[PDB]
Each structure stands twice: as C-alpha cells, then as structure tokens.
Amino acid sequence: IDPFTMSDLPCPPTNAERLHEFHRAIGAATPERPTPPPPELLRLRQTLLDEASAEVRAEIDHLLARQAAGEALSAGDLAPLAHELADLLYVTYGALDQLGIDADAVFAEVHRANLSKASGPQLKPEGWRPADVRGVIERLQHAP
Amino acid sequence: CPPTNAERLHEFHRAIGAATPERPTPPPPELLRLRQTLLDEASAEVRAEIDHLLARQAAGEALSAGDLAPLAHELADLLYVTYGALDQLGIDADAVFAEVHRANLSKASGPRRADGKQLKPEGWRPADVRGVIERLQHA
Numbered sequence: 621i622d623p624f625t626m627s628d629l630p631c632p633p634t635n636a637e638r639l640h641e642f643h644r645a646i647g648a649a650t651p652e653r654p655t656p657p658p659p660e661l662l663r664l665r666q667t668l669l670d671e672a673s674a675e676v677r678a679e680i681d682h683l684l685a686r687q688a689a690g691e692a693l694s695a696g697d698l699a700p701l702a703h704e705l706a707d708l709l710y711v712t713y714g715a716l717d718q719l720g721i722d723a724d725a726v727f728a729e730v731h732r733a734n735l736s737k738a739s740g741p742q743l744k745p746e747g748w749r750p751a752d753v754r755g756v757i758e759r760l761q762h763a764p
Numbered sequence: 765c766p767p768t769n770a771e772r773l774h775e776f777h778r779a780i781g782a783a784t785p786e787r788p789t790p791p792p793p794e795l796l797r798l799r800q801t802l803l804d805e806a807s808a809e810v811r812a813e814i815d816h817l818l819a820r821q822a823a824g825e826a827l828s829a830g831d832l833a834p835l836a837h838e839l840a841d842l843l844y845v846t847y848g849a850l851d852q853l854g855i856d857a858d859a860v861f862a863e864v865h866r867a868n869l870s871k872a873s874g875p876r877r878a879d880g881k882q883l884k885p886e887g888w889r890p891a892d893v894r895g896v897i898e899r900l901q902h903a
C-alpha cells in the first residue's frame with residue numbers, strides 16, 4: 621500500500637494460513653518452506669492426529685447409537701461431531717504447517733486430480749494425470 | 765476471493781453427481797459409516813507414513829524435504845475426506861473452523877506438555893460450535 625490506497629480489504633485468511641498464525645502465537649515451529657522435521661515433531665503430529673481421530677470416532681459412534689434407538693438426529697445434534705471434525709482439520713493442517721508445506725498448494729493439486737478424475741466414466745478420463753505432490757513440494761522449496 | 769478448500773469439496777461432490785445439502789442435515793446411518801471408514805483409511809495411511817519416516821530416522825538417515833512428499837500427499841488426502849464429511853453433513857467447514865481457531869489462539873498463554881502440545885491456560889473457554897450450527901441452520 622501507499623498514499624494512493626483508499627481501501628485495503630483483504631480476502632479472508634485460509635484455514636492453512638490460520639494454522640501459521642496459531643503456531644506463531646504459541647511459539648511452535650512454522651517454517652516458510654518445506655523443512656525436514658526432527659523426530660520429536662513427527663511424534664507430536666502423530667499424537668495429535670491420533671487424539672483427534674479418536675474423538676471423531678467417538679462422536680460418530682454416539683450419533684449411530686442414538687439414531688438406532690429411535691432418536692432421529694437433529695441438526696444441533698451434529699455440533700459435537702462438527703467440532704471434532706474441525707479439530708481433525710486443525711491438526712492435519714497443523715502437521716503440514718510445521719513441515720513448512722503450504723497446505724493450500726498441496727490440496728489444490730489433490731483437488732485438481734480428483735476433480736479431473738470425476739470427468740471420467742469411478743474411471744479415469746483420457747489424459748488424466750494423478751496428483752504430483754512431489755512437484756508441489758519442489759516448487760514450494762523455490763518460492764519467493 | 766479465491767475459493768476455499770471446503771468450497772472445493774462442495775464443487776467435487778456436485779461434479780460426481782452427489783450434490784450435498786446447503787445447510788446442516790442429519791445423515792442416514794450408512795453415510796456416517798461410510799465417512800468413518802474413509803477417515804479411518806486416510807488416518808491409517810498418515811499414521812503408517814509417519815511411522816515409516818521415524819524408522820528411517822532411527823536408522824540414522826537424514827531426511828530431505830523431498831522425502832516429505834508422500835506424507836504431505838496423505839495429509840492432503842485426509843483433509844479431503846475430512847472436509848468431505850463436513851460437506852456431506854451440510855456443514856460449512858470454514859464457519860466451524862473459524863470458531864475453533866479463535867478458541868485455539870486463546871490458549872497461547874497456557875503451558876506446554878512435554879511432547880510440545882499446547883495446553884490450556886487458567887479460565888480458558890471452549891469454542892461454541894453449537895452456536896455456529898444454529899447460525900448455519902437458520903437464516
């Protein structure tokens with residue numbers, strides 16, 4: 621911005637960018653570029669991923685058990701599961717951010733391949749190319 | 765503004781002809797069971813790849829950034845099926861995630877666990893995801 625800027629409205633931060641803000645706030649490693657992790661970092665990410673996936677499973681189970689007894693679930697009844705699913709997003713993004721890997725760039729490539737694959741007969745369309753996550757990591761290593 | 769990863773899942777489901785509801789919608793049992801299996805397989809792939817990398821480190825290998833591509837791929841696949849579950853429930857993942865994120869920033873003054881996990885300071889208050897769901901259902 622400069623003296624010519626009369627309005628400066630940014631696009632909302634992405635969920636991946638939010639993880640960077642969180643790790644900066646708590647003093648956790650959050651490298652700009654792909655960075656081989658110490659084993660202690662890998663162990664933590666594993667622990668948080670296990671913790672979060674167990675909580676998601678417990679809420680899905682609770683919903684199935686209630687549903688079975690003639691409780692027909694309501695929308696508000698989805699709130700704990702939604703919270704746990706968001707926590708699982710949070711620690712999945714969190715692992716990518718601590719690896720210095722732009723999760724949006726990797727996701728975009730996975731989405732490109734998946735969305736392209738949906739144009740096939742699920743079978744692949746002609747000329748389909750799978751997600752090249754290795755290429756994304758390489759290009760992230762050379763970014764501005 | 766470019767689309768979000770949650771909005772990408774909405775586009776994906778519309779593209780495979782399995783268009784998903786716009787507002788929170790209680791699911792049939794088989795949908796919960798399907799989404800759970802997808803989460804379990806994706807989580808197991810991530811779990812296995814982290815164990816794989818740790819064993820290489822225990823052998824003395826110095827990992828490179830390129831060595832991280834399979835893990836990054838599996839983590840992104842886990843994002844895909846996690847966002848996918850929220851989308852099939854009709855729940856805006858970004859609205860829920862913003863509420864969870866705000867309640868995680870408020871932990872910054874808390875202590876850390878020995879393994880590095882951020883713990884909660886005195887008086888911390890949880891995210892109110894019930895309120896986000898009510899916001900999404902109405903209006």
Ligand SMILES: O=c1ccn([C@H]2C[C@H](O)[C@@H](COP(=O)(O)NP(=O)(O)OP(=O)(O)O)O2)c(=O)[nH]1
Pocket residue numbers: 668671706707708710711714864868880881882883
């Ligand atoms: O180091 C951390 C700690 C927490 N988090 C995030 C992940 C998730 O969104 C949320 C989980 O925090 P807790 O493990 O403390 N679970 P919860 O808040 O549900 O505690 P409890 O079940 O005991 O009420 O905080 C991180 O990302 N990194």
Ligand SMILES: [Mg+2]
Pocket residue numbers: 675
């Ligand atoms: Mg909990």
